[PDB]
Specification:
Elements: H1 29-33, E1 44-47, E2 53-56, H2 59-65, E3 72-73, H3 81-84, H4 99-109, H5 113-116, H6 119-131, E4 138-140, H7 141-146, H8 148-158, H9 165-176, H10 184-204, H11 210-214, E5 218-219, E6 222-223, H12 226-256, H13 261-267, H14 272-282, E7 287-292, E8 295-298, E9 301-304, E10 308-312, H15 313-316, H16 351-364, E11 373-374, E12 382-383, E13 389-390, E14 394-396
Helix pairs in contact: 6-8, 9-10, 9-12, 10-12, 12-16, 14-16
Bound molecules: protoporphyrin IX containing FE and potassium ion.
Binding site for heme: 348
Protein name: Camphor 5-monooxygenase
EC number: 1.14.15.1
Amino acid sequence: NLAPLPPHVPEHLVFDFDMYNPSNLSAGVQEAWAVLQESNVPDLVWTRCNGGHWIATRGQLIREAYEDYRHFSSECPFIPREAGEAYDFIPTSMDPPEQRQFRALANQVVGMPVVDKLENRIQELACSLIESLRPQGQCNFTEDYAEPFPIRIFMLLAGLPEEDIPHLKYLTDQMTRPDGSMTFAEAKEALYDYLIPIIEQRRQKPGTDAISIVANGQVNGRPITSDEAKRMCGLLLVGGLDTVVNFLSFSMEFLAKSPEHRQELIERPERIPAACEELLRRFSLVADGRILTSDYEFHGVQLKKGDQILLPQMLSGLDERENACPMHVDFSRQKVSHTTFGHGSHLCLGQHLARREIIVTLKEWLTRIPDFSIAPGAQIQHKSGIVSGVQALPLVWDPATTKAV
Ligand code: HEM
Ligand SMILES: [K+]
């Protein structure tokens, strides 16, 4: 999709780059978008790709857009038109001050006591999935761990049956990274019809699970409604069934080629929260579509109320104005500075789940399987987009390297 140039843009800004096809399908998503940070490039570009849209290159503007909600809004963070004409989800798309009620119900929908009874069952769940791979000398880590594990936890959290997993992951993959004749409206329509029977059942039949919470919690002196419940749930399931599934896989595509770091995670299992937040920096994976509230002036051009700009978090995790070591990766630097988790205007409700399933992955894979490499004659192809993925991750290992844990 390529568009002719709107002559209110002056050309010296213009850059060739698509969000689903970044500079090179053979690199990692951070190293595929890095060409936008060369020392001649402005803080923001117009791309004629995808039908036309503004991108920021620099972490520094991204972190300033992110501060004040009155100047820029997350209210639809999904920029291509198809998502832009059909995305509308709670708490994100609800106006404040009441929005902060839904945020606290969501905060408790995502509460750990309902899964914390289950910690040894969830630790079994990891072992179950690795112990199906371990003596075989190979896996394909997307399908063989990363889809199963965090989804099967989120299916405990929501009371959802595991036979639904091919359904809901198809939907959270078409919304983030499209291909077929299902539009975003169609994805949303089909997820909202899947959700409604489950919601109105919990309404008569509440039990311990997040969907029973999101079907019955109180907000501003009234209960939540089923149409609010289905609208929170969509975004929440695009969290737990996409953001964390892709993050696991890029975290091990890294470790597979790196036999120094796999020792680092077993010399200091304690330090893993540093490493985890370093991997969050180093594979920052999101590009979000910030909404203009009012106005914005830069380099003689001006933006309008209702307009928007794409903020690559893959380049927020990379700007040498904010981030001390851009490509370089070591587990022992102090807290990151970017926006791949929120700032002033909005904030991530759920990355605590994802970063836990990482901090748990970074133990229960390692403890069993400390040495591993991508299969010979294979190659990896990353899948950039508004939230990014990978095509597959086919790994190998000598299996007598391992021990039963
Ligand atoms: C580590 C993996 C993940 C990353 C990096 C990530 C990152 C983010 C980012 C950057 C935002 C936008 C913040 C803003 O607009 O300022 C977002 C929002 C959100 N996240 Fe996460 N997230 C992840 C995992 C999760 C999970 C597992 C869930 C599911 C519960 C989730 C639920 C949400 C919700 C509900 C929003 C909307 C927040 C709001 O309106 O302010 N995220 N996330
Ligand atoms: K809206």
